[PDB]
Structure 1
Amino acid sequence: KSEVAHRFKDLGEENFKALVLIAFAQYLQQCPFEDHVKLVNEVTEFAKTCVADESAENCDKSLHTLFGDKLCTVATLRETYGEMADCCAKQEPERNECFLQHKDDNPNLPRLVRPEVDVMCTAFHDNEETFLKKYLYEIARRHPYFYAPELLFFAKRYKAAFTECCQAADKAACLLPKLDELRDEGKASSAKQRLKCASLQKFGERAFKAWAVARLSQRFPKAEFAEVSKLVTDLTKVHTECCHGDLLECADDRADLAKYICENQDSISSKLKECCEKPLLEKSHCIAEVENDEMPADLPSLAADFVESKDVCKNYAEAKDVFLGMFLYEYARRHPDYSVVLLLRLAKTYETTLEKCCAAADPHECYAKVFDEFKPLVEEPQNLIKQNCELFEQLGEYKFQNALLVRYTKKVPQVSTPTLVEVSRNLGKVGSKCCKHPEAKRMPCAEDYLSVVLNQLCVLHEKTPVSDRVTKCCTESLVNRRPCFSALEVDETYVPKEFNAETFTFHADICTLSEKERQIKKQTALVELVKHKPKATKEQLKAVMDDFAAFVEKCCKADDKETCFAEEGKKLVAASQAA
């Protein structure tokens, strides 16, 4: 009742100031930092008046109308943006949905360089408000879908890193690992979220709600159906708001939801003790990541209530959505060893059968062996898991990746080179994540990390589409993306693309570059190699590839006029078109 004020009171200025900063950051990505700070201030001063008098001019207005009006005021730079200006004509809810459509999932922003360590540690004490506020903005404008309250938590942890490491006996030794653990954590944290958002925005909330249901029931298998639905609802709400740009209420509701949980901990899950003792940001991050609680021991079989019962069709027709939710919750709670997508497949599979039976000839008879149809759908993933993982240990993550650059480039050569590189690199990072574990823990680990990663290629791509086959797989089902993609075979259509001269020669700036980032150019070359000769190709590449790896190492220790990079670059560009 005057909202800007309400949300300011619940959260306090720092967050309030930080939250808006992310918003603007996230929409106006090609906007330089001061401009945002200014807008934020105007927004923050204005908010405070509404704290004082609820009734004063525009305090009642919607947060999005408030954001929006402000966003309309100097998007008048479209000279550097373009056609987000269109949207200023339309009005709520139209405009915000029009805006969100222009979120750049891959902006042309200079790779954010980090300076020497003294320098960062100096700039901390000079102005630390600015230092962290810039931390937000640079991260935020690059990851425009980020789960906002989490950004905060990182920010907290980033400050924790500097607050200590600038007085560490050896600054850089404290600092770097911590920051790399942050650079690492965030990237994962951000993609997780991107999935969530896209499902809400392409597939809808009924689709998300199942997601939620399945994965919560796995988390708190002790808890009752009535409890979980409650959580799912509220969880859905939150994420709807953070995807829909509604950042302030997103945050507020998230921390309302942390609180309801920590109170109702014997009605939920045993293992919440440890999260719920911690501060308000730690809390939510923690419960976000709680390990799967002890499942109740000796539970009935489902068939009883979902197969043999002779009210099945009547209760299905009566409340299909609740009946299916209750089903899913049941099968979910008993299978933390299945992936969410699989449990999800099976609950869609049970739906489609019940739809087939309830009006046709003999319901008990046709649906009676529903559980039999699951068996195939269960085994298919586990097979593909084993296969990859042995491959992972045989090769070592680096080699494994390369191999996938092969699988995929050949499978879909039309797609951009840096896209394949990243996407495959991360697809490799699954093995480092999941093969670690035993085969209880593996399937949900890998298949749910994969969903995340294939969605990355999906949205990275939908930007400027080049392959229809990608475009198709992203489109049809969410659950069945991994299957769909798994299916593709080497692209016969594809005419092989010419010959870059300079793409296959490298300068001596390469030696200044790190391990990862040396390998990263190598992986780029590998993508371009197959974009070129898909034809006569097997491990004859591994030959030409080790050649690049080697000659790189030799040339960096040659004390030359950067000679053999350029000069013998001509040797290998001619000798490779042979080999």
Structure 2
Amino acid sequence: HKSEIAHRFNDLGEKHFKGLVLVAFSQYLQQCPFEDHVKLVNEVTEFAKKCAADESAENCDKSLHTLFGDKLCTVATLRATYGELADCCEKQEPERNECFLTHKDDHPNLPKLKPEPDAQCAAFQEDPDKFLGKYLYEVARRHPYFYGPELLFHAEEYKADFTECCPADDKLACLIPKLDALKERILLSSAKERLKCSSFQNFGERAVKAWSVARLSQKFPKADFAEVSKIVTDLTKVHKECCHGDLLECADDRADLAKYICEHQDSISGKLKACCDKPLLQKSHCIAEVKEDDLPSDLPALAADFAEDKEICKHYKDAKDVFLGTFLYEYSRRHPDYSVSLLLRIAKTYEATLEKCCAEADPPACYRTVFDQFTPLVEEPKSLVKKNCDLFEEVGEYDFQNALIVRYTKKAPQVSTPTLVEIGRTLGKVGSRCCKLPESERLPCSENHLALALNRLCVLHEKTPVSEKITKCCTDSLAERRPCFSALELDEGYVPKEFKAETFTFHADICTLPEDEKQIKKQSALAELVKHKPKATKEQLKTVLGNFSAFVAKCCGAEDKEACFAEEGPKLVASSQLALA
């Protein structure tokens, strides 16, 4: 094509093209106010219309990267608001784009977008096109690596809720349930795509490929290997592009894959019929979130082709990567009950056994029992999940969260308290999600979502590194990541953090906070007790936090609140010292 911007405008249409460009600009520039990005989006779209009518007109032949990066660099207040981001404009492509990507903020710390139902409907009434457009902007800047086409879909969910619910009598009780369910979908989606970009950045395509091969084979067991290879190749490209900012190519390539999957749906999966007669946004999303199809009845034991076939060392020698992919395809489709990282763990073992056995004198007799090395690999995650789920059921979410905060704080006491509270809190929600499921679904829920939380920690750690052992767990191997964090224990040579009274001094401003923030304030205190007294047992810690809870409720009920906090605070501090000894 002469003009790639023409090609994408034609392919995507004005509305989607607009929506993506707004998401792009809000991810690279997370602070500048709404109306500013609206102007930029408008100018790009105007220019895109100039190029589709005349593919030959000036600047239309330039690359999407050149055009987008040039646009960012002509923003007034770029240096004033974004500081070092302006230094990226001195670089030429492709180093200019890498520079912008590395300055995206994963913890921008913006005001929590609370659902104010009466206040929102009035904004929805006054300016609806701005209301849909502002949702995209607010979610984009909060989540900079969020899958662009994915955000459009969820933005369409947001206006469908508000149009429906606003004119009813009970405006709030129609909305708050629907919006709080949307929030949890955004958090999960952001987490999933962030792991994809993290994977490219620290491991490359080959690791992303194995991950997708394994997941898609579970998703589509009836699909043949050539079909799975095709989708994987196509999908890996979509993610590289979305992860790299190529937001228009991302969306375009995604649509082509959806069309493809739907045109080959009998060959791929019976669960796709519902998806495949929907409008294109909804069709893409449905395919991405489709359930795992039924396991076909006619599958032969893996043993014949992978332990028993005598010519495997020749097979392995001729096409190493293609042959292990076959193994991974065949193993993953039979085991929808296994987590993805576990499947990669197993496949790594298979690869490594073939290297030692084919080097040895007699391979067929050696590798005949390679499947026996997987038995311990499966029992290990099964044990972890059982133990956490029995704990979660025994004690409830809040306490389970606190247990994890104590656990992870002991593992890595150099990590910041906000980060430790975030991980413990998130992992407790995972317990609510996964422990209630059947065992066929419980292991993979637990370990797949645990991988998301550990990636979040790793991403914050790459930003502001504090611990070598965390760095090793985050950089060494994606498959072995969860095992690596599990193997962390408190160091014998960790020096208890110095006591600061202010750190355990509460005030009456806690009383006017919402419960979630009230808890965070209390859970932060928990982490700080551990950092200060790392050899205190979980049972000593639970008792002292209980006394802090009683102190906070007592004084928040009192008529003179700040005088209560003043009298009772110091007493509780000094007795807690003796309690934690």
- With the length of structure 2 as denominator, give the TM-score of the two structures: 0.96
Correspondence 1:72 to 2:73: yes
- Structure 2 Cα separation of the partners of residues 515 and 275 of structure 1: 39
- Structure 1 Cα separation of the partners of residues 188 and 318 of structure 2: 41
- Structure 2 Cα separation of the partners of residues 93 and 355 of structure 1: 39
User: Are the equivalent residues in 1 in contact too, given 2:23–2:148 (CA < 8 A)?
Assistant: yes
Superposed counterparts of 1:526-565, under 5 Å: 526-565=526-565
Change (3 A) 1:239 1:567: same
* Map of 2:405 onto structure 1: 405
* Map of 2:10 onto structure 1: 9
* Map of 2:190 onto structure 1: 190
Q: Which moved more, 1:569-578 or 1:486-495?
A: 569-578
Name the Cα RMSD after superposition: 1.7
Give the residue type in structure 1 aligned to 2:69: G
* Map of 1:290 onto structure 2: 290
- Structure 2 Cα separation of the partners of residues 42 and 27 of structure 1: 17
- Structure 2 Cα separation of the partners of residues 182 and 507 of structure 1: 34
Q: Which moved more, 1:52-61 or 1:28-37?
A: 28-37
Superposed counterparts of 1:519-530, under 5 Å: 519-530=519-530
Give the residue type in structure 2 aligned to 1:201: Q
Give the residue type in structure 2 aligned to 1:382: K
User: Are the equivalent residues in 1 in contact too, given 2:115–2:176 (CA < 8 A)?
Assistant: no
- Structure 1 Cα separation of the partners of residues 74 and 493 of structure 2: 48
Give the residue type in structure 1 aligned to 2:74: T
Residue 310 (structure 1) shift: 3.0
- Structure 2 Cα separation of the partners of residues 40 and 329 of structure 1: 43
Change (3 A) 1:354 1:19: same
Give the residue type in structure 2 aligned to 1:57: E
Residue 258 (structure 1) shift: 1.6
* Map of 1:459 onto structure 2: 459
* Map of 1:21 onto structure 2: 22
* Map of 1:121 onto structure 2: 121
User: Are the equivalent residues in 1 in contact too, given 2:508–2:561 (CA < 8 A)?
Assistant: no
- Structure 2 Cα separation of the partners of residues 454 and 519 of structure 1: 22
Give deviations 1:72-123, integer Å, cap 9, x for gaps. 223763343232333223222222122211111112x432343743221111
- Structure 1 Cα separation of the partners of residues 51 and 443 of structure 2: 51
User: Are the equivalent residues in 2 in contact too, given 1:508–1:562 (CA < 8 A)?
Assistant: yes
Q: Which moved more, 1:563-572 or 1:471-480?
A: 563-572
Residue 395 (structure 1) shift: 0.9
Give deviations 1:125-178, integer Å, cap 9, x for gaps. 111121222211121111111111111111111111211222121111112121
* Map of 1:484 onto structure 2: 484
Correspondence 1:571 to 2:571: yes
Superposed counterparts of 1:72-471, under 5 Å: 72-74=73-75, 77-107=78-108, 109-114=109-114, 116-471=116-471
- Structure 2 Cα separation of the partners of residues 498 and 288 of structure 1: 49
- Structure 2 Cα separation of the partners of residues 500 and 179 of structure 1: 40
User: Are the equivalent residues in 1 in contact too, given 2:146–2:193 (CA < 8 A)?
Assistant: yes
Residue 464 (structure 1) shift: 0.6
Give the residue type in structure 2 aligned to 1:564: C
User: Are the equivalent residues in 2 in contact too, given 1:191–1:456 (CA < 8 A)?
Assistant: yes
Give the residue type in structure 1 aligned to 2:472: K
Aligned residue for 1:512, secondary structure, equals coil
Change (3 A) 1:51 1:359: same
- Structure 2 Cα separation of the partners of residues 32 and 507 of structure 1: 34
Give the residue type in structure 2 aligned to 1:45: E
Select the structure that is richer in helix.
Answer: 2
Give the residue type in structure 2 aligned to 1:277: D
Gaps of 5+ in 2: none
- Structure 2 Cα separation of the partners of residues 114 and 338 of structure 1: 37
Give deviations 1:420-441, integer Å, cap 9, x for gaps. 0011111111211111112211
User: Are the equivalent residues in 1 in contact too, given 2:34–2:137 (CA < 8 A)?
Assistant: yes
Give the residue type in structure 1 aligned to 2:349: T
- Structure 1 Cα separation of the partners of residues 437 and 24 of structure 2: 38
Give deviations 1:200-228, integer Å, cap 9, x for gaps. 11101111111011110101101111111
User: Are the equivalent residues in 2 in contact too, given 1:50–1:56 (CA < 8 A)?
Assistant: yes
Percent identity over the alignment is 76
Residue 58 (structure 1) shift: 1.3
User: Are the equivalent residues in 2 in contact too, given 1:75–1:85 (CA < 8 A)?
Assistant: no
Give deviations 1:1-55, integer Å, cap 9, x for gaps. 1111111111111211111111111112232323222211111111110111111
User: Are the equivalent residues in 2 in contact too, given 1:413–1:491 (CA < 8 A)?
Assistant: no
User: Are the equivalent residues in 1 in contact too, given 2:4–2:63 (CA < 8 A)?
Assistant: yes
Give the residue type in structure 2 aligned to 1:87: C
Q: Which moved more, 1:383-392 or 1:351-360?
A: 351-360
Residue 71 (structure 1) shift: 1.8
Correspondence 1:50 to 2:34: no
- Structure 2 Cα separation of the partners of residues 537 and 362 of structure 1: 53
Residue 370 (structure 1) shift: 1.1
- Structure 1 Cα separation of the partners of residues 421 and 395 of structure 2: 18
- Structure 1 Cα separation of the partners of residues 85 and 519 of structure 2: 38
User: Are the equivalent residues in 2 in contact too, given 1:76–1:85 (CA < 8 A)?
Assistant: no
- Structure 1 Cα separation of the partners of residues 177 and 292 of structure 2: 29
- Structure 1 Cα separation of the partners of residues 438 and 115 of structure 2: 41
- Structure 2 Cα separation of the partners of residues 44 and 252 of structure 1: 16
User: Are the equivalent residues in 2 in contact too, given 1:75–1:84 (CA < 8 A)?
Assistant: no
- Structure 2 Cα separation of the partners of residues 570 and 542 of structure 1: 19
Aligned residue for 2:79, secondary structure, equals coil
Give the number of equivalent residue pairs: 578
- Structure 1 Cα separation of the partners of residues 494 and 461 of structure 2: 18
Aligned residue for 1:266, secondary structure, equals helix
Residue 570 (structure 1) shift: 2.7
- Structure 2 Cα separation of the partners of residues 497 and 259 of structure 1: 58
Give deviations 1:293-324, integer Å, cap 9, x for gaps. 11111321122222322321222111111111
- Structure 2 Cα separation of the partners of residues 132 and 492 of structure 1: 54
Give deviations 1:302-352, integer Å, cap 9, x for gaps. 222223223212221111111111111111111111111111111111111
User: Are the equivalent residues in 1 in contact too, given 2:27–2:104 (CA < 8 A)?
Assistant: yes
Aligned residue for 1:112, secondary structure, equals coil
- Structure 2 Cα separation of the partners of residues 75 and 477 of structure 1: 42
